[PDB]
DNA sequence: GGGCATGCCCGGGCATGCCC
DNA sequence: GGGCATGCCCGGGCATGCCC
């Protein structure tokens, strides 16, 4: 009956896990101490698919956006209206998350929580790798008016059977920014100094 | 053949011009040396009309929005996709600027131009009184992203016969800001100190 | 017989001159001394027309970029393959120069000499003011490979009677790049020290 | 369901591999440190290939070019506006690597990833050599505008069977530039001094 | 082979909505 | 009223086609 999704991590029995690749504007740079990733608008930022185990044929993966905050997180996270009049071809315009290099995307609008996300199928690593990547888009400012406002974000990571079980879950905080290594930065000083 | 209007001051017959009522987060503060006015999003910013002589009856006070540099001056003025999602039952939401307490405004959409302009009645001072005001709002700030976007305007105020002559133009720049009075002063100080 | 412009200074009769409003990346920035604009792509590009006497009703000003040294004076400009695959609605692809603000444009292509022009109403100035101003845009910088190639030009602006005849002729030399005060300071200075 | 092909070494069971040839202006230069192919537009750039054991007949070579940062990963490489109107006949203008001497090349455009490719016959080396050699060439530099633009790309080489089997892959990084040995010197010193 | 011109890149710093 | 976060701006400097 709740209409915010679950955020609370879970690898699972196939050991599900996210991975991330290691300059003031810098495209995107990962935090693990705040496990939280800082990019740029409209500009890649790679997602690692870790697992233990190789999880069953017909199997997605799924990003939704919720606001980090108790206070905004019944709020649906949506492209700000500036954006949203800015195309791929498939994405709505209101959909923060894209996923960018993949022929079977899609894009969803829940009936009942009116919230949106992007679906891709899971494939296993290629003989020799240890993880697969989606390239995920950001097509808004973390500091957007109208839209995201200076209010946090976490993406959550689901991994689904075809049946619609939750296999896994994992989640990051996003910051999308003009300058995510100034902005990593001056966070990440702030909580030794300050948290 | 232009599509930009003059922002030429022309006192005109009637010897026409403005004038100016005279704090951190005051609603608005006009700066002389500037010839500019500071003011916040939606509030109240009054402005006196004071002439030598009498306009004829069905004169018209014409108030419409250009940009001030010109880089951006052949750009039409209008509200940003956000606050145009967010009224007083006649304004359109498209315009910036709108009139408060009177019967009788006009929003205009030029069809050759596509710029914006909202009119009231001339009406000459009180037996005693030496000028009329009008309540102007502008309903962005001048930073917001997908429209002003932190580019300066003027507001030009043109005095009409009903016929559609010019009698007399004049014009003041404006910024709308969350905090007139910080803004003002700082401009000021800039002016002194370096312009 | 000839397919290239003339680009001999005329005054004329009405004494037709040309006039420039007066920072390493600044829009742009006019030298005096080199009679020569550097610009931006596709930003605001302001001339002044002056006159001592006023032209007759009808009279129209075209602009038209010829490649300023012998060597390429035969060759038609033309926007790059690059930039030609990037529109304002009327002006086409292949045009070097643009007129924005001005609802009575038209754009030529000589059928004999393939070159492109852009033609607006003559405006006699507003009472009160001394001149008449265009926005120009170029669509290229100098550097584009495939177009100007980093070869300068000349823009001509001609005023021209409603019959065709040429009334008065001024020109100009262009650099359209990325940094306008850099390219200018460095230039003056090689004028000045070996030229 | 990736539009992006693998670039990920797989010498296979026929033990595949890539050999390549041994001045600021030399044709091209290989940097074995970098894996770094540095080389001049439309000129050759020889590839050698090399077995341990022989390939089946009808065994196919396929060449491409991706983008090697993440953050262009998904954009396909395509000849520049420029030099796609500049032919040998049967390179359709879009591609950039075209391969000479072959009298069986095959050019291709991928349906569903719109990506480019071009593939010859593998042929075994004559009685007493090691390899076996292919002439690519490449049809824009790496700083080509509305192309590459300045960004690095990878070279795919895939050796595979009649039917599609992916047999072995390799891939080097390729610098198409004016002046080869000047661009490997500097990008071999900072490597040594700052990488 | 030595060197220039020029698009584009930063790391330093401003303006401004919003917070106390 | 005092102060932070954040998009965007520079002036300094690199990479690279082309020139001698
Ligand atoms: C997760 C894996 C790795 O460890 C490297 C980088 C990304 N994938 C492919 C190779
Ligand atoms: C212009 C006049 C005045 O001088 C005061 C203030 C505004 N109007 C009415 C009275
Ligand atoms: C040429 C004239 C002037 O002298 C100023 C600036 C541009 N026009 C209008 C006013
Ligand atoms: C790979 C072989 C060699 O070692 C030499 C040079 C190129 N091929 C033919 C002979
Ligand atoms: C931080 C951000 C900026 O403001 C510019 C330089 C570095 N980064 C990218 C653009
Ligand atoms: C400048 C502005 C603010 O930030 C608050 C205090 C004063 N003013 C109004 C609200
Ligand atoms: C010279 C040019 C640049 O390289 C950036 C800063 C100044 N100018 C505009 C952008
Ligand atoms: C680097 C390049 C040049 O600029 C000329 C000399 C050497 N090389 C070929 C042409
Ligand atoms: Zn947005
Ligand atoms: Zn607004
Ligand atoms: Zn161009
Ligand atoms: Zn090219």
Same mark, same amino acid.
């Given at each position: 009956?709740?209409?915010?999704?679950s955020?609370?991590?879970?690898?699972?029995?196939?050991?599900?896990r +996210?991975g991330?690749?290691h300059?003031?504007?810098?495209?995107?740079?990962?935090?693990?101490? +705040? =496990?939280?990733?800082?990019?740029?608008?409209?500009?890649? *930022?790679?997602?690692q698919?870790?697992?233990?185990?190789?999880?069953?044929?017909?199997?997605?993966?799924?990003?939704?956006?919720?606001?980090?905050?108790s206070?905004?997180?019944?709020? /649906?996270?949506?492209?700000?209206?500036?954006?949203?009049?800015? !195309?791929?071809?498939?994405?709505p315009?209101?959909?923060?998350?894209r /996923?960018?290099? =993949?022929?079977?995307?899609?894009?969803?609008?829940?009936? =009942?929580?009116?919230?949106?996300?992007?679906?891709?199928?899971?494939?296993?690593?290629?003989?020799?790798?240890?993880?697969?990547?989606?390239?995920?888009?950001?097509?808004?400012?973390?500091?957007?008016?109208?839209?995201?406002n200076?209010?946090?974000?976490?993406?959550?990571?689901?991994?689904?059977? !075809?049946?619609?079980?939750?296999?896994?879950? =994992?989640?990051?905080?996003?910051?999308? *920014?003009? *300058?995510?290594?100034?902005?990593?930065?001056?966070?990440?000083?702030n909580?030794?100094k300050?948290?």
């Open positions: 009956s709740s209409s915010v999704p955020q609370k991590t879970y690898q699972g029995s196939y050991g599900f +996210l991330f690749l300059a003031k504007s810098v495209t995107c740079t990962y935090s693990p101490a +705040l =496990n939280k990733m800082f990019c740029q608008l409209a500009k890649t *930022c790679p997602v698919l870790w697992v233990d185990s190789t999880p069953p044929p017909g199997t997605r993966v799924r990003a939704m956006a919720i606001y980090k905050q206070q905004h997180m019944t709020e /649906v996270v949506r492209r700000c209206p500036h954006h949203e009049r800015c !195309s791929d071809g498939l994405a315009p209101q959909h923060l998350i /996923v960018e290099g =993949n022929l079977r995307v899609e894009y969803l609008d829940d009936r =009942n929580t009116f919230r949106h996300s992007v679906v891709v199928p899971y494939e296993p690593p290629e003989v020799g790798s240890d993880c697969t990547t989606i390239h995920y888009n950001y097509m808004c400012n973390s500091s957007c008016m109208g839209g995201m200076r209010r946090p974000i976490l993406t959550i990571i689901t991994l689904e059977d !075809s049946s619609g079980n939750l296999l896994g879950r =994992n989640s990051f905080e996003v910051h999308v *920014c003009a *300058c995510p290594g100034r902005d990593r930065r001056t966070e990440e000083e909580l030794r300050k948290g």
